[PDB]
């Protein structure tokens, strides 16, 4: 219903994670649910 249209490589970047308990997921802007 709302597909990922495109994929673009942005190079190597400093990246991050957070962790939560219970279901190990959290909501982003626009309503996506990301894993720990």
């Amino acid at each position: 219903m709302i597909k990922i249209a495109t994929r673009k490589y942005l190079g190597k970047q400093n990246v991050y994670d957070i962790g939560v308990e219970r279901d190990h997921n959290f909501a982003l802007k626009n309503g996506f649910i990301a894993s720990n």
């Binding site: 709302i2 400093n14 990246v15 991050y16 982003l28 649910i33």
Partner: protein, 101 residues
């Protein structure tokens, strides 16, 4: 480890949307929104913070213009409640879960 770009915005109770880079770099104590396997939304604290160093990042752009910038192996929830790598959701043309908060 698989991980999200600095600019990826997480919804918090205390501060509204904040970039994960700020949350982790400043180790911000805050409360986020999670979903259980029945689709119930609840709030819970951030329990840990991790800088994962430098990794390959891709930007995925949805039909509605929304963006996900992350490591390609980072998992996201689909409509049917699976947790799958974002690159696989792209390649297999799957439907991301979209919660309205």
């Amino acid at each position: 480890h698989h991980c999200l770009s600095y600019e990826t915005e997480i919804l918090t109770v205390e501060y509204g949307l904040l970039p994960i880079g700020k949350i982790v770099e400043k180790r911000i104590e805050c409360t986020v929104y999670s979903v259980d396997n029945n689709g119930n939304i609840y709030t819970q604290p951030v329990a840990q913070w991790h800088d994962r160093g430098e990794q390959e990042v891709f930007e995925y752009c949805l039909e509605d213009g929304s963006l996900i910038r992350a490591t390609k192996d980072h998992k996201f929830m689909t409509v049917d409640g699976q947790m799958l790598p974002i690159d696989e959701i792209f390649e297999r043309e799957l439907d991301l879960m979209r919660v309205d908060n």
